[PDB]
């Protein structure tokens with residue numbers, strides 16, 4: 001589990017969204033596994049605005065932050081997981097690393113802020129849903 005809290009936005013994995021998320025929807029995209037809902041309280045996370053390919057992600061199933069290199073956001077074929085069939089997922093970045101279903105929502109961060117959240121795992125790869133292209137999270 002995990003979310004990003006920026007401005008009056010809450011960013012979560014679409015497969016972990018709550019009724020309150022859907023009842024306060026801003027934007028959602030199944031192909032990216034992302035959903036954004038509106039918040040009453042201001043959040044303090046900064047979204048990275050950059051093309052970094054190195055950062056650190058949180059792996060809840062190891063209670064550890066791991067430094068990783070990660071790929072550019074792309075359309076990646078993902079094997080079946082407990083929450084999606086095998087499919088193409090968009091805006092996805094991969095690294096070599098550990099990722100269980102419970103690790104979804106862990107933050108990937110670089111020197112510029114939050115890059116994305118854990119979304120996929122298996123075959124010794126961890127996939128992160130990028131948020132750096134969602135420039136509107138920074139305003140309004």
Ligand SMILES: [Zn+2]
Pocket residue numbers: 048049050051052110111112113
């Ligand atoms: Zn960066």
